[PDB]
From Swiss-Prot:
Record key words, sorted: Complement alternate pathway, Complement pathway, Cytolysis, Disulfide bond, Immunity, Innate immunity, Membrane, Membrane attack complex, Pyrrolidone carboxylic acid, Retinol-binding, Secreted, Signal, Target cell membrane, Target membrane
Record entry for activity regulation: Membrane attack complex (MAC) assembly is inhibited by CD59, thereby protecting self-cells from damage during complement activation. MAC assembly is also inhibited by clusterin (CLU) chaperones that inhibit polymerization of C9.
Subunit and partners: Heterotrimer of 3 chains: alpha (C8A), beta (C8B) and gamma (C8G); the alpha and gamma chains are disulfide bonded. Component of the membrane attack complex (MAC), composed of complement C5b, C6, C7, C8A, C8B, C8G and multiple copies of the pore-forming subunit C9.
Protein name in the entry: Complement component C8 gamma chain
GO cellular component terms, semicolon-separated: blood microparticle; extracellular exosome; extracellular region; membrane attack complex; plasma membrane
Domain of life where this protein originates: Eukaryota
General function of this protein: Component of the membrane attack complex (MAC), a multiprotein complex activated by the complement cascade, which inserts into a target cell membrane and forms a pore, leading to target cell membrane rupture and cell lysis. The MAC is initiated by proteolytic cleavage of C5 into complement C5b in response to the classical, alternative, lectin and GZMK complement pathways. The complement pathways consist in a cascade of proteins that leads to phagocytosis and breakdown of pathogens and signaling that strengthens the adaptive immune system.
Family the entry assigns: Belongs to the calycin superfamily. Lipocalin family.
Gene behind this protein: C8G
Organism: Homo sapiens
Length: 162
């Protein structure tokens, strides 16, 4: 459980973290790009919609990330073939960037999200520092396009996992 060694954002405020986030980069050893996040607090949990543009078509996945008893740490419960996904919001100023850690089957990944583009050099460099600290190399970092985003899918391309 590599993610247990990660410190969550001190006094994480779901209300301030709400809204739209754009994926900037991902650090992962895991063996179709571009992504948008819509986060809406739901009591103690977080209602989350992710959008990805594939072959010009927008696909939406609706999920619920439950509260785990620790601020900044959430859980996407397993269901069927989908394994559980642990999430920790680490560094974030709510107004420009967010560094999230995800773990599935013991494999840790790191994602950098931004409120708008481009992200500052200091944040990008900071993210890269965290990736190397997560024992991942520069070649395990995938930087996403500064275009190709979408944030609305029709009823035929919505996967509701809630
Ligand atoms: C506050 C909860 C935030 C949850 C962020 C989830 C980010 C997208 C994770 C996508 C995982 C995957 O499908 O590989």
């Amino acid at each position: 459980s590599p993610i247990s060694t990660i410190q969550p954002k001190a006094n994480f405020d779901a209300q301030q973290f709400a809204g739209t986030w754009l994926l900037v980069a991902v650090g992962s050893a895991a063996r179709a790009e571009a992504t948008t996040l819509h986060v809406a607090p739901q009591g103690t949990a977080m209602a989350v919609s992710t959008f990805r543009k594939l072959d010009g078509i927008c696909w939406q996945v609706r999920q619920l990330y439950g509260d785990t008893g620790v601020l900044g740490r959430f859980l996407l419960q397993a269901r069927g073939a989908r394994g559980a996904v642990h999430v920790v919001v680490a560094e974030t100023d709510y107004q420009s960037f967010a560094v999230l850690y995800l773990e599935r089957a013991g494999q840790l990944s790191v994602k950098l999200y931004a409120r708008s583009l481009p992200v500052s050099d200091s944040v990008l460099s900071g993210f890269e520092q965290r990736v190397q600290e997560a024992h991942l190399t520069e070649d395990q970092i995938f930087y996403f396009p500064k275009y190709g985003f979408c944030e609305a899918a029709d009823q035929f391309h919505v996967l509701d996992e809630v």
